[PDB]
Symmetry: D2
């Protein structure tokens, strides 16, 4: 019956949301402060993700290059997924694991912040992106789920890992969206007290 | 203090999620059955949205043209937002309200289903898209929030409206994502009992 | 000296343009008639390309979903490159050679026409796309350069190959654009004698 | 007859190409040197366009974030068109004339170079982008056609205008592509003598 597995998705989401709130508090806070300090340093936030989680990465930087809730001037943010002709020209020219890493190598400045999103934490394009950013004195903000994948063993703490207590990609993406909206509010209320 | 307004976003999300589950049950069910019947009719699902809600529209059709949880052959789905050179060539050539309506006029077939997403329910591009689809014997699945906007007064019931009980765009987008994932599971479990 | 290698690019382009005109005449004609018959059959044109040649594929379908020179109703055309959340969700889920083939499997109808573009003729994503379309009674229009790559040995003639007499990717893309604009005019003048 | 209007497009293209070569020599040279100096200053090239000319803007920066002919490290380049979730979130939030200007306001640095492309020279999104960049000590490289539109009366010469001697959008886009490929070679041969 459809209606009950509908409620299951809502039930499981809420349960994941709750567990996430009880656990990801401090990590999101630190990431927010890192973002606020980055934007105030004259730097930019770089975002990237995997699959439909790449829509979230674009969703974040779109909220910054524009506005979230508090009307404000555009804040410097870049998505690495948004560029099609580059990805299709790197993903092939002609291989896909370095689609994001090459963009960071060129655009990344000392003081920028990498917002890396990966539900599994095992997307090679996002991993190499993180590897790249580490090489350039660039803080990482990693949104993950599951165990954290190979992402975990790539971070000290100029970086933050936000690991969602869930093993379902759908539930991880849903929590990630809440996290992204929280950061936006944090950035908004801090930089533009309205 | 950042950490408390973080929890607020989680609290408000959960509260919205709960209210949505208690109310949007039947509407999501009907939409699911309409989608399942559409795909079984040999037709396709057409999605479109506004802003970062346009990332959700692409997220859905990407879950279909590929896979959600159950591995399956690609299902016919199209996003109207995904096409850049068209939107930028309609949004200007040279005005933006008909970016989606013109795509439906050309691609839309009798039996297709329009997945229209709008947090405010007042995005003219999504409205005209719905107006267009009504003209072609095409069921509408409208994901909305707030009061439902002008979208509401455009639908009979070959169509469904799923209105999220919230007046915050962030909370509406978060619930919309849960709804989209539910439909994917509905489509998956129904068409491919795995 | 910059100014002379500038003129070289213009000289080489013109020379390639000329050679192309003297040779690709009939092939472009046939492709045009195939497109016109496709659109008149109630079918759609499917386009795809590789790299910055993927911008051309989108450029074509944008000219159709909208208008070229003669103002007209939108014609049914789809680009496989335009969909980001799908490619990034196929390119990884999680491998890239079937990003286009899977989209054709789902969306492709009997009577549609595949506009496959590849400067080298050796892009696996475009090849498998062609392989896929052959399996579905779908004419191929292949824009190539060099020797034609592996694309050549995949076509009978419900299909057309348009091979640019050049071994430089830049010169091939430049000629391809002229070819695309010719087809647009052909479609425009034939279907809407204005 | 189709075959003769095919040759007409080739004939007119070649004629436009020739006229362009005889006239746009110095302008392309200066733009190249400005780009080379920009990249050597530690700055980035910002590109934007209108419609299918927006595919060219992405095509250029993709050639830089990756490679053209000479294999090299990625060069810092950004397209303003590539970002979908932002444009759709600016184009509406909720109006379209400032989709590019807002991105320049946030990302634009002193020393960057704006590559503005417009066939008509009358696209308001590209105009305001130029207006924005002028306000920030940023050189403009404007690819235009026709009379140059309102773009012309917005430039001194820290900026360059490259006006194609043609009144046909198709012929202008074709010449623009040659110009873009010339600059790529200029940048390649100058910065990486291979």
């Amino acid at each position: 019956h459809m209606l009950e597995q509908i409620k299951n998705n809502f039930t499981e989401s809420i349960q994941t949301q709750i567990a996430a709130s009880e656990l990801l508090g401090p990590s999101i806070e630190h990431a927010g402060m890192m973002m606020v300090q980055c934007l105030l340093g004259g730097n930019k936030i770089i975002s990237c993700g995997n699959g439909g989680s790449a829509g979230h990465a674009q969703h974040f930087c779109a909220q910054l290059l524009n506005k979230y809730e508090t009307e404000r001037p555009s804040l410097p943010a870049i998505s690495l997924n948004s560029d099609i002709s580059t990805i299709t020209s790197i993903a092939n020219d002609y291989q896909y694991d370095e689609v994001f890493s090459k963009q960071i190598r060129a655009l990344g400045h000392n003081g920028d912040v990498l917002l890396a999103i990966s539900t599994s934490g095992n997307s090679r394009n996002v991993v190499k992106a993180i590897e790249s950013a580490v090489s350039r004195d660039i803080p990482i903000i990693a949104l993950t789920g599951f165990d954290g994948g190979d992402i975990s063993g790539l971070l000290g703490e100029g970086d933050v890992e936000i690991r969602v207590p869930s093993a379902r990609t759908s539930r991880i993406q849903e929590v990630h969206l809440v996290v992204l909206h929280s950061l936006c509010e944090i950035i908004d209320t801090t930089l533009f007290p309205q």
